[PDB]
Amino acid sequence: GSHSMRYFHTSVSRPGRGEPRFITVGYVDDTLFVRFDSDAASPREEPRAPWIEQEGPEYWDRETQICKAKAQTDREDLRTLLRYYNQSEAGSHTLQNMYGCDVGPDGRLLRGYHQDAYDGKDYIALNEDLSSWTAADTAAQITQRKWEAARVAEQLRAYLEGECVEWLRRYLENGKETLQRADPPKTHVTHHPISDHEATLRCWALGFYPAEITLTWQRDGEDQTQDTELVETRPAGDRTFQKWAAVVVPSGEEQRYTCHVQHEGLPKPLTLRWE
């Protein structure tokens, strides 16, 4: 189906300790493929997926230069935001950047992304037309004026519409074995007796990809959203994900409860009961 490429950037200033910490990751869909940490002795962009390791030296050289370059711009930008907000040098602040593209099955660009956050809140975001900006406050509006004059939106639009989509399609092709293939969740229902009168039912989805999944509990064909403990999707640690949904039921009434599992890897939605 549709695929996405994303680059995530975080710079955090460290008053007294030293210069700001810079960390960035690259994701194709739900697959981490690159990383850069400024905490390294001789920092370089490194491969975290197999299919990205194919790229030659000029690639890793250019990427590492870009990552180092971004870290430095983040220092310049962090200082600027201090003066904008009249904040103190004693305080630590966070700057967060994400840009990416989404493509369809036809390999055509659905939309392009470029967002920035300051201290965990939205700062300035590139609109879906790739020719306008959304600013959070008067400070972001100051930046908006600069970036319009500097044609940053036109810069990004060229990249998003072109080089982003091309290379994404390349990565998609190079790692088509893992990237395109979807792993269905291994599913079972477990039984956990709380008291003599009450038991807990937990529905499991294990080792699936991508992270996108839906787990629901139903009581007599009726939905139990109010009384369902639904944990966040978690990484298993091997590029796969895990998730469970649990309900508490009265002892002897397990047959009333069904677990419904909807994932991409599954040909059809599943319905599970404790057995």
Partner: peptide
């Protein structure tokens, strides 16, 4: 491949 601002 990454984008870098001018």
């Amino acid at each position: 491949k990454r984008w870098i601002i001018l």
